[PDB]
Amino acid sequence: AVCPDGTRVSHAACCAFIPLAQDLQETIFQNECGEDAHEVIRLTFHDAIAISRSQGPKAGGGADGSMLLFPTVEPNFSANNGIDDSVNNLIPFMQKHNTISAADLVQFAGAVALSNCPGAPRLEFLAGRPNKTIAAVDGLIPEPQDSVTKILQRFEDAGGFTPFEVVSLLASHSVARADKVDQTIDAAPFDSTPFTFDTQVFLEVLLKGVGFPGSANNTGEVASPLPLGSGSDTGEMRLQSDFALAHDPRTACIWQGFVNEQAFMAASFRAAMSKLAVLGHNRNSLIDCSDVVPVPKPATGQPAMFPASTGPQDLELSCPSERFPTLTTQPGASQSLIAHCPDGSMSCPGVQFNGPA
Numbered sequence: 001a002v003c004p005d006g007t008r009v010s011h012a013a014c015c016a017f018i019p020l021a022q023d024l025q026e027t028i029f030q031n032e033c034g035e036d037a038h039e040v041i042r043l044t045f046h047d048a049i050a051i052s053r054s055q056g057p058k059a060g061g062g063a064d065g066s067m068l069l070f071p072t073v074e075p076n077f078s079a080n081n082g083i084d085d086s087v088n089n090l091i092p093f094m095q096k097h098n099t100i101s102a103a104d105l106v107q108f109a110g111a112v113a114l115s116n117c118p119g120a121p122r123l124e125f126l127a128g129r130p131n132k133t134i135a136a137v138d139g140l141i142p143e144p145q146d147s148v149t150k151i152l153q154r155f156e157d158a159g160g161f162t163p164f165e166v167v168s169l170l171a172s173h174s175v176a177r178a179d180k181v182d183q184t185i186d187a188a189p190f191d192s193t194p195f196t197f198d199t200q201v202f203l204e205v206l207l208k209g210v211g212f213p214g215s216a217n218n219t220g221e222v223a224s225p226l227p228l229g230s231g232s233d234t235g236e237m238r239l240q241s242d243f244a245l246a247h248d249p250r251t252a253c254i255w256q257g258f259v260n261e262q263a264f265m266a267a268s269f270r271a272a273m274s275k276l277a278v279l280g281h282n283r284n285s286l287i288d289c290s291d292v293v294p295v296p297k298p299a300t301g302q303p304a305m306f307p308a309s310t311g312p313q314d315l316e317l318s319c320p321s322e323r324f325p326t327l328t329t330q331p332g333a334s335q336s337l338i339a340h341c342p343d344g345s346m347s348c349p350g351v352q353f354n355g356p357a
């Protein structure tokens, strides 16, 4: 089909996603892997994962736009703290781009957001999810204080995800920060490169923790290897769940296996996201609109490296059967600040709409 803008695409039903991508980029992401992009990526997961094989369809419909269509229900669950901003940012697009279901909007917006993160894959994007659903029930969203048994079971019950697929999906913590875990600090990144879809999170969670970016007593948090912050440049935070996954016998080798393995990580993330994005649907009933996902920014191709103030002597290794790679260390005696903005500048406020969530 040829779309009104002249773009030739696979299927006529994919045309409306072209102006949606442009609007999302111009309005909320600015082609950056920044605050608003991160928030949308998280929303893609919280929308999709609220489904349960065991509980049946009344517990939730998966990747169904329930977050947008019932903005006063799930976003107010404690496990969804902070999801409100992303919901409020996407509702105006749902209202304007009113040929595209809320469910499809969520998944597409995440694909567009991810495309702004150097190294990310170009997600598969299938379209045609209905615009009607139910609000999900509480308890379906993994929380950082949860055990590996509980996490793995939650993902198995949501969609048959394997441990490999779970850890693959956690590549998203390469482009992720926390506002709610610690009340006293904002935007605490989970790796030293929160604007770059690289393997640094996998490396950095394996380092010995030496302090906290904020306070020491938060649920779901453990000591960080890079806790130094100053001004807007908050120190790295470590989630208990990521730590636990990195060390548990079920997942330690998978976790380590992504260190310095960018292409492997990105491909594995793509495959798991292909499954996540269609929870609640038969994929054989959705049309393939992958060709209207923007082309992602490429990695530079550089290997993972130990951040300054860390090195191999700081590793806490847990995979007996796989050799930990040889990596360089960035020079310097003390920790570098992790920039708050994609350009290293002093100001980069994200666009935010008010709304019902």
Ligand code: HEM
Residues within 6 Å of the ligand: 035, 038, 039, 041, 042, 045, 081, 082, 142, 143, 144, 145, 151, 169, 170, 172, 173, 175, 176, 177, 178, 179, 180, 181, 182, 220, 239, 241
């Ligand atoms: C065991 C599973 C997981 C747990 C326990 C978990 C937990 C968390 C927590 C606690 C935060 C910080 C929220 C805040 O305080 O502001 C966060 C952020 C984030 N998570 Fe996860 N997460 C998990 C899986 C995922 C997956 C599967 C994805 C997507 C594929 C995802 C994407 C993100 C993103 C992009 C952010 C950053 C949001 C921002 O910077 O605004 N997470 N996660």
Ligand SMILES: *[C@@H]1O[C@H](CO)[C@@H](O[C@@H]2O[C@H](CO)[C@@H](O)[C@H](O)[C@H]2NC(C)=O)[C@H](O)[C@H]1NC(C)=O
Residues within 6 Å of the ligand: 069, 094, 095, 096, 098, 099, 100, 101, 102, 131
């Ligand atoms: C999907 O459902 C939503 C929610 O009902 C629809 O949103 C409405 O969109 C119209 C414009 O078409 C606006 O006038 C309303 O204000 C919106 N309602 C709400 C509650 O925000 C949306 O149009 C539907 N989309 C599709 C593809 O059917």
Ligand SMILES: *[C@H]1O[C@H](CO)[C@@H](O)[C@H](O)[C@@H]1O
Residues within 6 Å of the ligand: 308, 330, 331, 332, 333, 334, 335, 336, 337
């Ligand atoms: C980042 O900053 C630290 C200092 O805070 C250095 O040690 C490192 O070399 C890099 O310049």
Ligand SMILES: [Ca+2]
Residues within 6 Å of the ligand: 046, 047, 048, 049, 050, 060, 061, 062, 063, 064, 065, 066, 067, 136
């Ligand atoms: Ca949902």
Ligand SMILES: [Ca+2]
Residues within 6 Å of the ligand: 173, 174, 175, 191, 192, 193, 194, 195, 196, 197, 198, 199, 200, 201
């Ligand atoms: Ca990163």
